[PDB]
């Protein structure tokens, strides 16, 4: 359920898994970072 | 001489302000960050982060450090992730579902039961 | 069917009405605690979305 207002709770379904001139100094490999961040993102959406 | 550091977790903010130097334990060794540091993304070990403003220290269970010349973001974790802890929670959640479900049942009844409760729920208000 | 039995039922239902009136304000108080917890967790998720966008693009 989503909080539209204090008098209206809306039932919903939200998709979880299937989702500019410089670059970062990646210390570990970029795969390891992207694999870990996508997991943290999905868990955070479930917690929210 | 200062940048906007923001230490945050999935539940709430841990710190937010202006800092002179940020000391973090990266996946490959200790770091000392100051204003204007080049853009940097890094995986953090479980341990204390030391900040200079005066000096502040906060214990973090791991996370991600994201750096930009005008912003420093620490995406901390509330618990220490790990292959045993990460797998244990999945096995307990699976175990819970095994114990909960015994066998299949009538599924066509959903519509009738939903209509029964939709009519009954209206009379109450 | 009897004035005294009716007087006992009225007191019983009145005692219940007093707590459901209090429980409404307790629910509003806990609603505000939940709303502040919803806002406190947003900065972390939007920032993780901003990183994955570049580290993939």
Curated annotation (Swiss-Prot), chain A:
It is found in: Cell inner membrane. Signal peptide: none annotated. Belongs to the ATPase gamma chain family. Produces ATP from ADP in the presence of a proton gradient across the membrane. The gamma chain is believed to be important in regulating ATPase activity and the flow of protons through the CF(0) complex. F-type ATPases have 2 components, CF(1) - the catalytic core - and CF(0) - the membrane proton channel. CF(1) has five subunits: alpha(3), beta(3), gamma(1), delta(1), epsilon(1). CF(0) has three main subunits: a, b and c. This is ATP synthase gamma chain. The lineage of its organism: Bacteria, Pseudomonadati, Pseudomonadota, Gammaproteobacteria, Pseudomonadales. The chain holds residues 173 to 229 of 286 of the full protein.
From Swiss-Prot, chain B:
Keywords: ATP synthesis, Cell inner membrane, Cell membrane, CF(1), Hydrogen ion transport, Ion transport, Membrane, Transport. F-type ATPases have 2 components, CF(1) - the catalytic core - and CF(0) - the membrane proton channel. CF(1) has five subunits: alpha(3), beta(3), gamma(1), delta(1), epsilon(1). CF(0) has three main subunits: a, b and c. Belongs to the ATPase epsilon chain family. Produces ATP from ADP in the presence of a proton gradient across the membrane. It is a peripheral membrane protein. SUPFAM superfamilies: Epsilon subunit of F1F0-ATP synthase C-terminal domain (SSF46604), Epsilon subunit of F1F0-ATP synthase N-terminal domain (SSF51344). The gene is atpC. GO terms for molecular function: ATP binding; proton-transporting ATP synthase activity, rotational mechanism. The lineage of its organism: Bacteria, Pseudomonadati, Pseudomonadota, Gammaproteobacteria, Pseudomonadales. One of its GO terms (cellular component) is proton-transporting ATP synthase complex. Coiled coil: none annotated. It is found in: Cell inner membrane. The keyword NADP does not apply. This is ATP synthase epsilon chain. It comes from the Bacteria.
């Amino acid at each position: 359920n989503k909080f539209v207002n204090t008098m209206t709770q809306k039932p919903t379904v939200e998709q979880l898994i299937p989702l500019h001139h410089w670059d970062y100094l990646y210390e570990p490999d970029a795969k390891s970072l992207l694999d870990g961040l996508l997991v943290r993102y999905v868990e955070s959406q479930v917690y929210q | 001489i200062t940048v906007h550091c923001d230490i945050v977790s999935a539940e709430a903010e841990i710190f937010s302000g202006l800092v002179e130097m940020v000391i973090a334990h990266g996946a490959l060794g200790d770091l000392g960050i100051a204003p204007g540091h080049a853009p940097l993304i890094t995986d953090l070990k479980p341990g204390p982060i030391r900040l200079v403003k005066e000096q502040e220290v906060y214990y973090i269970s791991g996370g991600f450090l994201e750096v930009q010349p005008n912003m420093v973001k620490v995406l901390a974790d509330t618990v220490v992730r790990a292959g045993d802890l990460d797998e244990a929670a999945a096995q307990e959640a699976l175990k819970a579902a095994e114990k909960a479900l015994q066998g299949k049942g009538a599924e066509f009844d959903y519509s009738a039961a939903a209509a029964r409760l939709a009519e009954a729920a209206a009379q109450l208000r | 069917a009897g004035a005294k039995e009716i007087r006992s039922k009225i007191a019983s239902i009145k005692s219940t009405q007093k707590i459901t009136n209090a429980m409404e304000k307790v629910a509003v108080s806990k609603m505000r605690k939940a709303q502040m917890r919803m806002a406190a967790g947003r900065p972390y998720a939007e920032r993780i979305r901003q990183v994955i966008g570049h580290l993939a693009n």
